[PDB]
Amino acid sequence: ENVLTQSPAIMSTSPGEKVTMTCRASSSVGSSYLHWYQQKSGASPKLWIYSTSNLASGVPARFSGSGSGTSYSLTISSVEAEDAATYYCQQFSGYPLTFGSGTKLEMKRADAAPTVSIFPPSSEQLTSGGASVVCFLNNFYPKDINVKWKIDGSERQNGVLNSWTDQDSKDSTYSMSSTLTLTKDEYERHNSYTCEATHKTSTSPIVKSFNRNE
Amino acid sequence: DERETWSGKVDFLLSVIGFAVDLANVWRFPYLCYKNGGGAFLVPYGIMLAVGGIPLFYMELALGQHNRKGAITCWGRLVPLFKGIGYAVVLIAFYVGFYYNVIIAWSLRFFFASFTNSLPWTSCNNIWNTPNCRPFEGHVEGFQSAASEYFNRYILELNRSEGIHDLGAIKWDMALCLLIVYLICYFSLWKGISTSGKVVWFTALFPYAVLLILLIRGLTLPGSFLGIQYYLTPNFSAIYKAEVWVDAATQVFFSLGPGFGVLLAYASYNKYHNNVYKDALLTSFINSATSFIAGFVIFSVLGYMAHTLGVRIEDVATEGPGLVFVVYPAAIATMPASTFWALIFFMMLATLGLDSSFGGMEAIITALSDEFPKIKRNRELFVAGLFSLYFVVGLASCTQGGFYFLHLLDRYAAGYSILVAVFFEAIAVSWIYGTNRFSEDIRDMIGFPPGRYWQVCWRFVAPIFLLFITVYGLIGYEPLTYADYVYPSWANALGWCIAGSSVVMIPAVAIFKLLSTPGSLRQRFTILTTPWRD
Amino acid sequence: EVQLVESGGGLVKPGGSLKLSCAASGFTFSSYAMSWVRQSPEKRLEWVAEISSGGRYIYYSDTVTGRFTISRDNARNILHLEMSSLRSEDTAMYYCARGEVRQRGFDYWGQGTTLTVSSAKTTAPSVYPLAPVCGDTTGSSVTLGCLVKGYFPEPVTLTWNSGSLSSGVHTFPAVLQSDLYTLSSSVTVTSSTWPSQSITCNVAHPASSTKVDKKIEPR
Ligand SMILES: CC(C)CCC[C@@H](C)[C@H]1CC[C@H]2[C@@H]3CC=C4C[C@@H](OC(=O)CCC(=O)O)CC[C@]4(C)[C@H]3CC[C@]12C
Ligand SMILES: CC(C)CCC[C@@H](C)[C@H]1CC[C@H]2[C@@H]3CC=C4C[C@@H](O)CC[C@]4(C)[C@H]3CC[C@]12C
Ligand SMILES: OC[C@H]1O[C@H](O[C@H]2[C@H](O)[C@@H](O)[C@@H](O)O[C@@H]2CO)[C@H](O)[C@@H](O)[C@@H]1O
Ligand SMILES: OC[C@H]1O[C@H](O[C@H]2[C@H](O)[C@@H](O)[C@@H](O)O[C@@H]2CO)[C@H](O)[C@@H](O)[C@@H]1O
Ligand SMILES: COc1cccc([C@]2(O)CCCC[C@H]2CN(C)C)c1
Ligand SMILES: CCCCCCCCCC
Ligand SMILES: [Cl-]
Ligand code: NA
Ligand code: NA
């Protein structure tokens, strides 16, 4: 098997800038067989470049392609945000046919602090003996963010489900959801629940919290 | 599959380029241009080449590489009802070798004869000339050129044969050349394409050396341009004549030689995923390129004869061996350093024939190796027996009346035989097997299906292109004659047997394979129309 | 124009056997070789099987070989894929890609169909609405939430107000944890819109006949 690896794995770029991505084969590949596929977040892949350099119909001329032997590259002249995608290379010379690891082109924007909002356990869920506290962290950049839960004063580390979203298509931002879940007994045996989200926009983390009585 | 494969890629290229480029490039293509409207002849030539020949040339080279077996087996594994095609195609290749190698011996006897300072064929005061001699070609038949009496009365001694029946004395100086030919074959392809693949480097590239020399000495000659005019000066009236679209169509067919079992055999050792499409076009071009080039070499010298030596060009612009053995050697004789142009020329003519004679042998050797493994396990030994049958019968062509026997084989050994055979190849592949199947086969091999252009040439054009020739080729039937010699009716009947002994094996093995299998008729054809790969 | 549609596929117990179908339309399906490419839930593409146009040349990935079978119906223009001895790493979305010219690649790709191989068992979600904390509320726009917890397998369909408000919706992808998925979506509407106007969570989970609306009422 002909192993293909692409770099970088993720690539933040400001619109208008110039981006380059590389595709390197474990075995040599004839130039006429290496293709490139663009795949948008939650869509079928699309043939983008066939046989090293030739664009497919509908592919803007701002896209180029070059390479030979064991090293090929895809190059975007000046990017717009309609090019935020994940790009895969593919070889068609031998079997098995192989696809590369892909490069995720993400849009770069100005930083943005999150908007934390904490939600107590639902009333219907409490009847079910369960109690999960939901904390939303919405519209912020860059992607990395670090939540921390505190039941009463003590930080609680296990029991959490975090889920980040894909980069938003209008403001190029991020949102994330953390869900600390508990038994009804362990939740009805405390009152302060805190959700503090640390982010690069402030050394002091944005905090949200509530008491089980008010 | 542990089958063999070309030691190098050029060994397949030069083995094909050499089978295709022979004396017909040097002697019949320049004549056709000269006779049929000059450069304008390139139109119907190119059209008949673009829609009829290269379609067929491509089709065979792809089959041979894909089905990976020689000419007999490759039609059994493709359409079993038509396995007889492979059998016909092979003995046709067997029949041709009974005369084709002689033309090389003539070259070799002239090559050996050109070891002197006064080439013998220039003067007409020798022991073999007649009082009815001229120093250069004319347009009366009682009075032949000094370089034509040397050919008919000393080299061939044809003047001592009253016909086909009077073969007369065996001339061993020619027999020794015919052996030197079959030996030059044996030790160049007994051990396989491991060695034949390399031998073709000299025999396929050396003509291009001699061409470039003779193209310079020809073009740097008083009156050289006058020849180039008669070669290419266009008269588009001939376009209108359909007798020219047959001469283009027929020359394209025999100059590339598709459906002959050779390209199939040569491709069978190709690596599967080799781009045969590229090879087809690259090879076919170098072919017609060499003929176009070669007309410059011939007609530069041919113009020099008219301007300097004072001959009517229509009397020296001939085709066939008369040109390479009488006319062109006669103009060499007038040039300074004539002994040099002689040697390269005849060593050119020899090498021009050897590569092409190699292909005939291999199409037989490979078709039999890939079917009767006693042959395959005993290659070196088998070929010995083959080439000896050639030599022994070949002694009949080394007699004084030898030519008459060759002329018969030139007309019947592979005349109307191959034309019907390839017609059934086009039909078997485009229709019975299927372009559907065939294009799917190619895509697996080179990576893309053949363009809808090729498919259409394979399925309709090529059958009526072959039909174009066989129809307009039977309309011009004339009994076999040379000079005033009318061949007897039993000699033609004989030549009809050897012409029939090929085609007959098409409906023979169709019938024999039908009767040798069990079921009902539509269950009969289905079992004999489904290939092996399927 | 040219368009492909993959169909069949869903949950399968390990060792089981499922058959997928790709319905071609908009071109001579007989003339084009198709191939099956799958994409794992870790977003890595992997080729599975290729079938020639006439169907007589069939190349398999070394992974799926002997277990899968890619047949082809040039009559009805349907490309098939027969799976047996299904393992869990076979879990993916399966694509039907049209490629004839190797030097041109896969012209067109279908929507794709989703195979989940898991011994785990189908369960339905319980949708909890997320009304904000009763205190404070001293802000300019308010964020609501909805919690679709403890379901399997994917997918789930969360719209807000029957699919009528989209600006301000952030529906987070599902995350499996101990054979169960948890999803949540957050909606931020102006303070004048809620609880003035009705905000409902419209969750839908077809794999277990679930159609649940949980309106958001305050605390
Ligand atoms: C020195 C002179 C005499 C050379 C002789 C000319 C030939 C070498 C030229 C003349 C016309 C050319 C042909 C004209 C048309 C075509 C069609 C062309 O078709 C395609 O482009 C592919 C079809 C497809 O894929 O759909 C392929 C090349 C070919 C055979 C050309 C091959 C080379 C040809 C025969
Ligand atoms: C009129 C004179 C000048 C023509 C001379 C042209 C000669 C030099 C050209 C014409 C045919 C050519 C050959 C055709 C085929 C190939 C195969 C390729 O893989 C290597 C080059 C090679 C081996 C070419 C070598 C050069 C060649 C022999
Ligand atoms: O034309 C035939 C040939 O016959 C004679 O040659 C004999 C030769 O004399 C013998 O030595 C032996 O080699 O067989 C030859 C037959 O080719 C004549 O001498 C010769 O002139 C003539 O061509
Ligand atoms: O001067 C040429 C010389 O050659 C003649 O022919 C030879 C021939 O060259 C050899 O190939 C041999 O095969 O046949 C002939 C026998 O010698 C003659 O030898 C001679 O008359 C003449 O000078
Ligand atoms: C096995 O079949 C053959 C072997 C050798 C030569 C031929 C010829 O037909 C002989 C007649 C002239 C054309 C030649 C083919 N072209 C030039 C390549 C056929
Ligand atoms: C048509 C080819 C016939 C050649 C003679 C067979 C020789 C057999 C040697 C084993
Ligand atoms: Cl020619
Ligand atoms: Na040759
Ligand atoms: Na030729």
PDB file of N, CA, C and O in Angstrom, chain B residues 397-446:
ATOM      1  N   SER B 397      14.034 -21.171 -54.991  1.00  0.00           N
ATOM      2  CA  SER B 397      14.100 -19.772 -55.388  1.00  0.00           C
ATOM      3  C   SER B 397      15.516 -19.308 -55.696  1.00  0.00           C
ATOM      4  O   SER B 397      15.693 -18.184 -56.179  1.00  0.00           O
ATOM      5  N   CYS B 398      16.523 -20.138 -55.431  1.00  0.00           N
ATOM      6  CA  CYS B 398      17.901 -19.842 -55.791  1.00  0.00           C
ATOM      7  C   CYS B 398      18.296 -20.452 -57.133  1.00  0.00           C
ATOM      8  O   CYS B 398      19.486 -20.469 -57.468  1.00  0.00           O
ATOM      9  N   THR B 399      17.335 -20.958 -57.903  1.00  0.00           N
ATOM     10  CA  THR B 399      17.630 -21.465 -59.230  1.00  0.00           C
ATOM     11  C   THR B 399      17.521 -20.338 -60.257  1.00  0.00           C
ATOM     12  O   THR B 399      17.171 -19.198 -59.944  1.00  0.00           O
ATOM     13  N   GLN B 400      17.828 -20.670 -61.511  1.00  0.00           N
ATOM     14  CA  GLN B 400      17.864 -19.661 -62.564  1.00  0.00           C
ATOM     15  C   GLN B 400      16.472 -19.109 -62.839  1.00  0.00           C
ATOM     16  O   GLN B 400      16.295 -17.898 -63.011  1.00  0.00           O
ATOM     17  N   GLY B 401      15.468 -19.981 -62.863  1.00  0.00           N
ATOM     18  CA  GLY B 401      14.091 -19.544 -62.970  1.00  0.00           C
ATOM     19  C   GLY B 401      13.477 -19.252 -61.622  1.00  0.00           C
ATOM     20  O   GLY B 401      12.257 -19.356 -61.449  1.00  0.00           O
ATOM     21  N   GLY B 402      14.322 -18.878 -60.658  1.00  0.00           N
ATOM     22  CA  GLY B 402      13.840 -18.653 -59.306  1.00  0.00           C
ATOM     23  C   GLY B 402      12.764 -17.588 -59.235  1.00  0.00           C
ATOM     24  O   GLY B 402      11.718 -17.789 -58.614  1.00  0.00           O
ATOM     25  N   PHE B 403      13.003 -16.446 -59.890  1.00  0.00           N
ATOM     26  CA  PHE B 403      12.081 -15.311 -59.827  1.00  0.00           C
ATOM     27  C   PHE B 403      10.641 -15.723 -60.109  1.00  0.00           C
ATOM     28  O   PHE B 403       9.716 -15.308 -59.401  1.00  0.00           O
ATOM     29  N   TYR B 404      10.432 -16.529 -61.156  1.00  0.00           N
ATOM     30  CA  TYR B 404       9.077 -16.931 -61.523  1.00  0.00           C
ATOM     31  C   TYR B 404       8.366 -17.586 -60.349  1.00  0.00           C
ATOM     32  O   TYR B 404       7.172 -17.355 -60.121  1.00  0.00           O
ATOM     33  N   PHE B 405       9.096 -18.402 -59.587  1.00  0.00           N
ATOM     34  CA  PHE B 405       8.544 -19.040 -58.396  1.00  0.00           C
ATOM     35  C   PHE B 405       8.282 -18.027 -57.287  1.00  0.00           C
ATOM     36  O   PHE B 405       7.259 -18.114 -56.596  1.00  0.00           O
ATOM     37  N   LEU B 406       9.178 -17.050 -57.110  1.00  0.00           N
ATOM     38  CA  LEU B 406       8.931 -15.991 -56.136  1.00  0.00           C
ATOM     39  C   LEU B 406       7.719 -15.160 -56.523  1.00  0.00           C
ATOM     40  O   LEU B 406       6.852 -14.880 -55.686  1.00  0.00           O
ATOM     41  N   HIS B 407       7.655 -14.737 -57.790  1.00  0.00           N
ATOM     42  CA  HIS B 407       6.553 -13.892 -58.239  1.00  0.00           C
ATOM     43  C   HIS B 407       5.208 -14.530 -57.930  1.00  0.00           C
ATOM     44  O   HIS B 407       4.257 -13.838 -57.549  1.00  0.00           O
ATOM     45  N   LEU B 408       5.112 -15.851 -58.083  1.00  0.00           N
ATOM     46  CA  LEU B 408       3.881 -16.553 -57.743  1.00  0.00           C
ATOM     47  C   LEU B 408       3.562 -16.399 -56.260  1.00  0.00           C
ATOM     48  O   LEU B 408       2.429 -16.074 -55.886  1.00  0.00           O
ATOM     49  N   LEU B 409       4.561 -16.614 -55.398  1.00  0.00           N
ATOM     50  CA  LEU B 409       4.343 -16.472 -53.963  1.00  0.00           C
ATOM     51  C   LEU B 409       4.059 -15.027 -53.578  1.00  0.00           C
ATOM     52  O   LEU B 409       3.269 -14.776 -52.661  1.00  0.00           O
ATOM     53  N   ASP B 410       4.681 -14.068 -54.267  1.00  0.00           N
ATOM     54  CA  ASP B 410       4.382 -12.661 -54.013  1.00  0.00           C
ATOM     55  C   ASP B 410       2.910 -12.350 -54.233  1.00  0.00           C
ATOM     56  O   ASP B 410       2.370 -11.426 -53.612  1.00  0.00           O
ATOM     57  N   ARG B 411       2.243 -13.106 -55.101  1.00  0.00           N
ATOM     58  CA  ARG B 411       0.863 -12.825 -55.465  1.00  0.00           C
ATOM     59  C   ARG B 411      -0.155 -13.669 -54.713  1.00  0.00           C
ATOM     60  O   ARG B 411      -1.305 -13.240 -54.572  1.00  0.00           O
ATOM     61  N   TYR B 412       0.229 -14.836 -54.224  1.00  0.00           N
ATOM     62  CA  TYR B 412      -0.735 -15.781 -53.672  1.00  0.00           C
ATOM     63  C   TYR B 412      -0.443 -16.214 -52.245  1.00  0.00           C
ATOM     64  O   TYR B 412      -1.384 -16.488 -51.497  1.00  0.00           O
ATOM     65  N   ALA B 413       0.829 -16.283 -51.839  1.00  0.00           N
ATOM     66  CA  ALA B 413       1.160 -16.749 -50.494  1.00  0.00           C
ATOM     67  C   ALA B 413       0.409 -15.967 -49.417  1.00  0.00           C
ATOM     68  O   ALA B 413      -0.056 -16.552 -48.429  1.00  0.00           O
ATOM     69  N   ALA B 414       0.265 -14.652 -49.602  1.00  0.00           N
ATOM     70  CA  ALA B 414      -0.385 -13.751 -48.645  1.00  0.00           C
ATOM     71  C   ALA B 414      -1.032 -12.576 -49.372  1.00  0.00           C
ATOM     72  O   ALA B 414      -0.801 -11.421 -49.047  1.00  0.00           O
ATOM     73  N   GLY B 415      -1.842 -12.860 -50.385  1.00  0.00           N
ATOM     74  CA  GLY B 415      -2.435 -11.795 -51.169  1.00  0.00           C
ATOM     75  C   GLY B 415      -3.836 -11.454 -50.722  1.00  0.00           C
ATOM     76  O   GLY B 415      -4.039 -10.533 -49.927  1.00  0.00           O
ATOM     77  N   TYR B 416      -4.818 -12.200 -51.220  1.00  0.00           N
ATOM     78  CA  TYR B 416      -6.198 -12.055 -50.766  1.00  0.00           C
ATOM     79  C   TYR B 416      -6.454 -12.837 -49.494  1.00  0.00           C
ATOM     80  O   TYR B 416      -7.510 -12.681 -48.878  1.00  0.00           O
ATOM     81  N   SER B 417      -5.499 -13.673 -49.111  1.00  0.00           N
ATOM     82  CA  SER B 417      -5.521 -14.428 -47.870  1.00  0.00           C
ATOM     83  C   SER B 417      -5.675 -13.514 -46.663  1.00  0.00           C
ATOM     84  O   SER B 417      -6.653 -13.615 -45.917  1.00  0.00           O
ATOM     85  N   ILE B 418      -4.704 -12.620 -46.459  1.00  0.00           N
ATOM     86  CA  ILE B 418      -4.693 -11.815 -45.242  1.00  0.00           C
ATOM     87  C   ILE B 418      -5.855 -10.829 -45.215  1.00  0.00           C
ATOM     88  O   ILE B 418      -6.388 -10.530 -44.141  1.00  0.00           O
ATOM     89  N   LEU B 419      -6.282 -10.321 -46.379  1.00  0.00           N
ATOM     90  CA  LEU B 419      -7.328  -9.297 -46.387  1.00  0.00           C
ATOM     91  C   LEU B 419      -8.633  -9.813 -45.789  1.00  0.00           C
ATOM     92  O   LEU B 419      -9.287  -9.106 -45.014  1.00  0.00           O
ATOM     93  N   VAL B 420      -9.033 -11.038 -46.134  1.00  0.00           N
ATOM     94  CA  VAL B 420     -10.229 -11.601 -45.514  1.00  0.00           C
ATOM     95  C   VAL B 420      -9.969 -11.925 -44.048  1.00  0.00           C
ATOM     96  O   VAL B 420     -10.836 -11.715 -43.191  1.00  0.00           O
ATOM     97  N   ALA B 421      -8.764 -12.406 -43.729  1.00  0.00           N
ATOM     98  CA  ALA B 421      -8.447 -12.762 -42.347  1.00  0.00           C
ATOM     99  C   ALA B 421      -8.620 -11.567 -41.415  1.00  0.00           C
ATOM    100  O   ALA B 421      -9.271 -11.672 -40.368  1.00  0.00           O
ATOM    101  N   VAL B 422      -8.058 -10.413 -41.786  1.00  0.00           N
ATOM    102  CA  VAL B 422      -8.211  -9.226 -40.949  1.00  0.00           C
ATOM    103  C   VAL B 422      -9.652  -8.728 -40.960  1.00  0.00           C
ATOM    104  O   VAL B 422     -10.126  -8.180 -39.956  1.00  0.00           O
ATOM    105  N   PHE B 423     -10.373  -8.893 -42.075  1.00  0.00           N
ATOM    106  CA  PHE B 423     -11.787  -8.532 -42.066  1.00  0.00           C
ATOM    107  C   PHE B 423     -12.530  -9.295 -40.985  1.00  0.00           C
ATOM    108  O   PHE B 423     -13.412  -8.743 -40.319  1.00  0.00           O
ATOM    109  N   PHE B 424     -12.187 -10.566 -40.793  1.00  0.00           N
ATOM    110  CA  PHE B 424     -12.800 -11.344 -39.730  1.00  0.00           C
ATOM    111  C   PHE B 424     -12.244 -10.974 -38.362  1.00  0.00           C
ATOM    112  O   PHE B 424     -12.913 -11.210 -37.352  1.00  0.00           O
ATOM    113  N   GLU B 425     -11.045 -10.393 -38.310  1.00  0.00           N
ATOM    114  CA  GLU B 425     -10.514  -9.908 -37.041  1.00  0.00           C
ATOM    115  C   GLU B 425     -11.264  -8.662 -36.590  1.00  0.00           C
ATOM    116  O   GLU B 425     -11.674  -8.558 -35.429  1.00  0.00           O
ATOM    117  N   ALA B 426     -11.463  -7.711 -37.506  1.00  0.00           N
ATOM    118  CA  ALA B 426     -12.275  -6.540 -37.198  1.00  0.00           C
ATOM    119  C   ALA B 426     -13.679  -6.950 -36.769  1.00  0.00           C
ATOM    120  O   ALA B 426     -14.211  -6.441 -35.776  1.00  0.00           O
ATOM    121  N   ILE B 427     -14.286  -7.895 -37.495  1.00  0.00           N
ATOM    122  CA  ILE B 427     -15.637  -8.341 -37.162  1.00  0.00           C
ATOM    123  C   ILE B 427     -15.648  -9.086 -35.832  1.00  0.00           C
ATOM    124  O   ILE B 427     -16.528  -8.864 -34.992  1.00  0.00           O
ATOM    125  N   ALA B 428     -14.671  -9.971 -35.612  1.00  0.00           N
ATOM    126  CA  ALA B 428     -14.641 -10.751 -34.376  1.00  0.00           C
ATOM    127  C   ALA B 428     -14.531  -9.867 -33.143  1.00  0.00           C
ATOM    128  O   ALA B 428     -15.121 -10.181 -32.102  1.00  0.00           O
ATOM    129  N   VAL B 429     -13.807  -8.756 -33.242  1.00  0.00           N
ATOM    130  CA  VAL B 429     -13.464  -7.927 -32.087  1.00  0.00           C
ATOM    131  C   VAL B 429     -14.466  -6.801 -31.878  1.00  0.00           C
ATOM    132  O   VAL B 429     -14.976  -6.611 -30.775  1.00  0.00           O
ATOM    133  N   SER B 430     -14.756  -6.027 -32.923  1.00  0.00           N
ATOM    134  CA  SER B 430     -15.717  -4.941 -32.769  1.00  0.00           C
ATOM    135  C   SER B 430     -17.138  -5.440 -32.548  1.00  0.00           C
ATOM    136  O   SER B 430     -17.945  -4.719 -31.950  1.00  0.00           O
ATOM    137  N   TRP B 431     -17.465  -6.653 -32.991  1.00  0.00           N
ATOM    138  CA  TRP B 431     -18.850  -7.104 -33.029  1.00  0.00           C
ATOM    139  C   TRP B 431     -19.108  -8.342 -32.183  1.00  0.00           C
ATOM    140  O   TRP B 431     -19.998  -8.329 -31.326  1.00  0.00           O
ATOM    141  N   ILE B 432     -18.363  -9.426 -32.401  1.00  0.00           N
ATOM    142  CA  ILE B 432     -18.662 -10.660 -31.675  1.00  0.00           C
ATOM    143  C   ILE B 432     -18.183 -10.577 -30.232  1.00  0.00           C
ATOM    144  O   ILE B 432     -18.948 -10.832 -29.293  1.00  0.00           O
ATOM    145  N   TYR B 433     -16.907 -10.258 -30.031  1.00  0.00           N
ATOM    146  CA  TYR B 433     -16.378 -10.019 -28.696  1.00  0.00           C
ATOM    147  C   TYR B 433     -17.087  -8.794 -28.138  1.00  0.00           C
ATOM    148  O   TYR B 433     -17.949  -8.907 -27.261  1.00  0.00           O
ATOM    149  N   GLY B 434     -16.759  -7.626 -28.683  1.00  0.00           N
ATOM    150  CA  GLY B 434     -17.465  -6.408 -28.347  1.00  0.00           C
ATOM    151  C   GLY B 434     -16.549  -5.239 -28.059  1.00  0.00           C
ATOM    152  O   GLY B 434     -15.632  -5.356 -27.241  1.00  0.00           O
ATOM    153  N   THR B 435     -16.775  -4.107 -28.734  1.00  0.00           N
ATOM    154  CA  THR B 435     -16.085  -2.881 -28.342  1.00  0.00           C
ATOM    155  C   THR B 435     -16.413  -2.519 -26.899  1.00  0.00           C
ATOM    156  O   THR B 435     -15.576  -1.952 -26.187  1.00  0.00           O
ATOM    157  N   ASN B 436     -17.639  -2.824 -26.461  1.00  0.00           N
ATOM    158  CA  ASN B 436     -17.993  -2.741 -25.049  1.00  0.00           C
ATOM    159  C   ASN B 436     -16.976  -3.486 -24.198  1.00  0.00           C
ATOM    160  O   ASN B 436     -16.366  -2.915 -23.287  1.00  0.00           O
ATOM    161  N   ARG B 437     -16.783  -4.774 -24.490  1.00  0.00           N
ATOM    162  CA  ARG B 437     -15.747  -5.534 -23.800  1.00  0.00           C
ATOM    163  C   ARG B 437     -14.365  -4.955 -24.076  1.00  0.00           C
ATOM    164  O   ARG B 437     -13.550  -4.800 -23.159  1.00  0.00           O
ATOM    165  N   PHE B 438     -14.089  -4.613 -25.337  1.00  0.00           N
ATOM    166  CA  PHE B 438     -12.730  -4.248 -25.730  1.00  0.00           C
ATOM    167  C   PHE B 438     -12.271  -2.958 -25.062  1.00  0.00           C
ATOM    168  O   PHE B 438     -11.128  -2.864 -24.601  1.00  0.00           O
ATOM    169  N   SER B 439     -13.142  -1.950 -25.011  1.00  0.00           N
ATOM    170  CA  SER B 439     -12.783  -0.701 -24.349  1.00  0.00           C
ATOM    171  C   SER B 439     -12.608  -0.903 -22.850  1.00  0.00           C
ATOM    172  O   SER B 439     -11.707  -0.317 -22.238  1.00  0.00           O
ATOM    173  N   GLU B 440     -13.466  -1.726 -22.242  1.00  0.00           N
ATOM    174  CA  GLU B 440     -13.305  -2.066 -20.833  1.00  0.00           C
ATOM    175  C   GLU B 440     -11.975  -2.757 -20.581  1.00  0.00           C
ATOM    176  O   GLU B 440     -11.368  -2.577 -19.519  1.00  0.00           O
ATOM    177  N   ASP B 441     -11.514  -3.552 -21.546  1.00  0.00           N
ATOM    178  CA  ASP B 441     -10.224  -4.217 -21.426  1.00  0.00           C
ATOM    179  C   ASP B 441      -9.095  -3.197 -21.415  1.00  0.00           C
ATOM    180  O   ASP B 441      -8.182  -3.264 -20.582  1.00  0.00           O
ATOM    181  N   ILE B 442      -9.155  -2.238 -22.341  1.00  0.00           N
ATOM    182  CA  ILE B 442      -8.103  -1.236 -22.480  1.00  0.00           C
ATOM    183  C   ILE B 442      -8.041  -0.339 -21.249  1.00  0.00           C
ATOM    184  O   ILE B 442      -6.956  -0.030 -20.742  1.00  0.00           O
ATOM    185  N   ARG B 443      -9.203   0.100 -20.753  1.00  0.00           N
ATOM    186  CA  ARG B 443      -9.216   0.986 -19.591  1.00  0.00           C
ATOM    187  C   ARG B 443      -8.533   0.338 -18.395  1.00  0.00           C
ATOM    188  O   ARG B 443      -7.805   1.004 -17.650  1.00  0.00           O
ATOM    189  N   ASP B 444      -8.778  -0.953 -18.176  1.00  0.00           N
ATOM    190  CA  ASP B 444      -8.096  -1.646 -17.091  1.00  0.00           C
ATOM    191  C   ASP B 444      -6.591  -1.631 -17.304  1.00  0.00           C
ATOM    192  O   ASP B 444      -5.819  -1.663 -16.337  1.00  0.00           O
ATOM    193  N   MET B 445      -6.162  -1.539 -18.562  1.00  0.00           N
ATOM    194  CA  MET B 445      -4.757  -1.684 -18.914  1.00  0.00           C
ATOM    195  C   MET B 445      -4.026  -0.350 -18.822  1.00  0.00           C
ATOM    196  O   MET B 445      -3.042  -0.217 -18.086  1.00  0.00           O
ATOM    197  N   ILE B 446      -4.491   0.653 -19.571  1.00  0.00           N
ATOM    198  CA  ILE B 446      -3.790   1.930 -19.622  1.00  0.00           C
ATOM    199  C   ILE B 446      -4.450   3.011 -18.767  1.00  0.00           C
ATOM    200  O   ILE B 446      -3.810   4.038 -18.493  1.00  0.00           O
TER     201      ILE B 446
END
